[PDB]
Point group: C3
Chain length 397, copies 3
């Protein structure tokens, strides 16, 4: 059975056939046609605040380095030397004056131009051997990249998202904490888990203290109560109402938290006393933003959280959670690290356990597609539809 | 060279060509056509004595759960939730009231029927979404399963084995100890090792104190001495003489132990003072039973041992040894755990070393089939013939 | 794109396309057509000085045992028993009277003849079941093997090398130390690294104290200064001038060390006070010998170092470094182990880091061939040309 035959018979109401989650064949297609073609969230721009600052990441098999250039522009490159291919930057982050290959010291400017290569002979043309650029955009303080030479339209998303994101002043953030975990499930299982709260009541004690179980929230006609919330926010100058992409790739909405909760903490109170941004009112709740295939995000009045989803193998996925706070917020004074991070550290661990257990069952040859809950899993169906449509379009002529 | 060409040129007197032991291709065929098609030993029924008791196991890629239902019947199911596929039972063993999926709490009765699924809509038909059954038989206190929807005949074996097994009263056993090891060799190498004692004199000091080296015993015209033993047993009402399957799949015989030994212990005396069963006389020896591809067994007058062979990868096999004693036998009083288990713990470790060393040599491209000993390895040839015949029949039309 | 199409478009001046370094497909071809076909360095003959002495090694998937036979000849065999295939010698080295299989004790003479096999029946012909020989040569105290039944010409190399190697009296050596490391890069990356010192100034502080950076040395018209060195050696009876194989497989030359250095030590002085061989004058420097694909070597006046390169996987290579000293040199008296070994232990660790970092960059799909330095990497181009030519010839008719 070919991939085309499986896609042909797929019904929207059901989980995917086994090979979509387990096969090296589909994994290769997901990299080739999804991760290597779409815009992806990389890191917050505040990680590149300093002169000569760089950060590195892997995307599938690609090695990327993002750097703050002399002119203050942030640029991304393939972290592969044009001589014999070596990584140039080995550390996760650092600062340099130039990009100097550790092997034979070919030396590049922070805009990628090759400025020195030792003893290469008279016929060497350094202009042919600069670092290969990676397409890059700045979404209001969040850096996105695209590995394709012909990137899709990012501007439609950027323009829609700006009014929602600008009130968070993310350019003025710092990273308070980063957590990187490997979940032993296919990247699609990580997404299907994220896009519903059908599992939340039984699995997430800590999160449920602040995050509502209502399908309207975690998932996808606006209820009167929800509309009232949007109106409180927007009367105060804080954009809140739904935005959903035409093709389903992204969504934004600012949702209410549980009864009286203001933040993702065990006591429901703000984690940080010096807020990141100018969000009002104080109970504006959580700005939810997803953008497939790389990221979901929760921006609160006091701090923000970004999540980055990267594929590792057919049955492994890396999830990176970053806590953003105001750059002038002081650990031990304006926030406590445990208080700030404990809810989502626990939640992520619970999701990982669930995803791994789901993956273990799916590996049985007895596993067959089952029906999603229309009421509780509309967001899961929405994701699976986006994925299948994306794959179909990429495989077409 | 195709699998069919290799099977075509195979001669009975020789070990198999390399790919049978090392190739992912043959490993996939062995799962598809052998392990996924034949009856397999799972666990003793005494593991499921209690109300709501369950046990889990993996067979190749299948995840199975065996449960004692309300009506007292033991049943097996695919341990994959009909919603999104999750394992339902994660522990090796336990007790439940219902089978409740840890993900979104779909809840099944112990007969597999789906009795509650939250918010699935008006068009949801729970009768289509019960757990998928796994075929199951009870061989006189030992649970066997078959992953095929069209299982082979088990009744012929069951009827032949009953008179031999019933005298052991296995329904009245408890598990005194279980040992699970991974041997780094193909499952067929584990079997070829088991089916001869050509290696025993040099490799098994402890076992040789009680287990005879005679090829007649470990392996396949009955000698006068052996016939005399069968007659002592059968005069006392204990079935002992050879039973061999028409197609070679299974064999039973009650064999004498070494000079004066009564059990598999370092001193040769019974391990347990309260015997499991009604075997007579006290020196009735060891009831040997194999059933390919999953199990060999030694049932003694005082206790019994079951062995389960499960494939892990082309060059890895899991062997599970279970010691059964009378349910009323008390550790520290009627038996000592070290005394009961030390002989076969050592023996299994020695076999593992031998199998791994054999596998290491076989991985050389210089390895070629060699001749089995007609006198010392007739049982190995018998196994290899059963395997090749089974594969041929499965590949045919 | 087929292997043939990649080979067709290859230009000499450039590093190889990705799959040559990363693909399982090319790895299989490199084993089949290079490692399994050419002469390979195994071990120094002094490891087999004693009666009944043996040593074992793996080459790709082959398991080899080399043994000193009763008649004093050194012979090699496939370390796979002719019965059911088991390794016979499990230890890295040892002494035996006979080669006795640990499984069922088939017993072979040290010339490989099967002299005892238990209970094999009347129709068993032991003359058909001796150990399979491996072709073997002794290069003046260094043992080389070839896994092909039709080995290439070794004599041309042997005759050229003898005058250079005989002055080292390697038959009179002992092994002072052996270091075995795994480098996480393709075997070709290990070679490309070895065949240039373009990386040395920045990466090898310790080695640079004694080993010149001059491209003439580490790499490939002889300079006046170098000729003067050759002449000092040869006037003293020590062969030194270049020898390069017609087909590029091997090279020998005795090169000067840095200003006043005599040996590879932190202080530049001889590591061992009792010299291995009769090399003169004392500042004769380092005899460099490579022989693709298995070995590079440095023979100094006081001690010698051999290096053996063996493939482990597409992105892993085992490098074994052996320090040879005079058999009568006493550790703690004539040499200090740290002083003798520290320079190359550090150097090998630095090379490993470089190779692994190079491999990591090459794994990016953005990696493309880049140009080698004509002045600094002529030896790298020479190796890559030898490799590609070897592969082309093996794939031809
Ligand atoms: O491992 C390294 O050195 C860089 C960091 C991100 C992945 N590649
Ligand atoms: O790992 C688990 O949770 C179950 C137990 C047997 C194999 N699958
Ligand atoms: O592992 C062993 O026992 C032998 C030693 C070299 C490789 N094979
Ligand atoms: S690989 Fe970067 S300078 Fe050589
Ligand atoms: S996967 Fe079992 S209830 Fe959802
Ligand atoms: S495998 Fe060597 S004697 Fe049997
Ligand atoms: Fe969750
Ligand atoms: Fe054994
Ligand atoms: Fe080096």
């Amino acid at each position: 059975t070919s991939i085309h035959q499986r896609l042909d018979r797929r019904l929207s109401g059901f989980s995917l056939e086994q090979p979509f989650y387990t096969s090296p064949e589909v994994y290769a297609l997901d990299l080739q046609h999804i991760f290597y073609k779409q815009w992806l969230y990389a890191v917050p721009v505040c990680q590149l605040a300093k002169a000569g600052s760089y950060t590195t990441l892997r995307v599938g098999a690609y090695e990327v380095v993002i750097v703050r250039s002399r002119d203050g522009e942030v640029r991304a490159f393939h972290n592969s030397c044009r001589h014999r291919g070596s990584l140039i930057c080995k550390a996760r982050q650092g600062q340099v004056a130039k990009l100097v290959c550790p092997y034979h010291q070919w030396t590049y400017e922070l805009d990628g131009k090759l400025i020195w290569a030792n003893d290469m002979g008279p016929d060497f043309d350094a202009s042919k051997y600069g670092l290969k650029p990676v397409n890059l955009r700045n979404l209001d303080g969040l850096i996105y990249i695209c590995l394709s030479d012909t990137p899709p339209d990012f501007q439609t998303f950027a323009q829609l998202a700006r009014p929602y994101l600008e009130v968070h002043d993310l350019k003025d953030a710092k990273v308070a904490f980063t957590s990187t975990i490997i979940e032993k499930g296919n990247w699609k299982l990580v997404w299907e888990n994220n896009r519903e709260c059908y599992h939340c009541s039984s699995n997430h004690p800590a999160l449920c203290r602040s995050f509502p179980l209502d399908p309207e929230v975690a998932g996808v006609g606006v209820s009167k109560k929800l509309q009232a919330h949007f109106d409180r926010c927007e009367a105060a100058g804080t954009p809140a109402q739904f935005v959903l992409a035409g093709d389903g790739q992204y969504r934004l909405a600012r949702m209410p938290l549980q009864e009286k909760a203001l933040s993702y903490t065990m006591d429901g109170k703000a984690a940080v006393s010096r807020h990141l941004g100018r969000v009002a009112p104080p109970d504006a709740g959580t700005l939810l933003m997803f953008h497939y295939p790389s990221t979901w995000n929760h921006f609160l009045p006091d701090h923000s959280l970004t999540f980055r989803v990267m594929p590792i193998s057919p049955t492994e996925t890396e999830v990176t959670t970053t806590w953003l706070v105001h750059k002038d917020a002081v650990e031990g004074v304006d926030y406590d690290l445990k208080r700030l991070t404990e809810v989502w550290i626990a939640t992520n661990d619970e999701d990982r356990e669930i995803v791994e257990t789901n993956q273990q069952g799916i590996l049985s040859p007895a596993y067959v597609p089952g029906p999603y809950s229309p009421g509780q899993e509309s967001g899961v169906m929405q994701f699976v539809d986006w994925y299948a449509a994306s794959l179909e379009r990429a495989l077409a002529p």
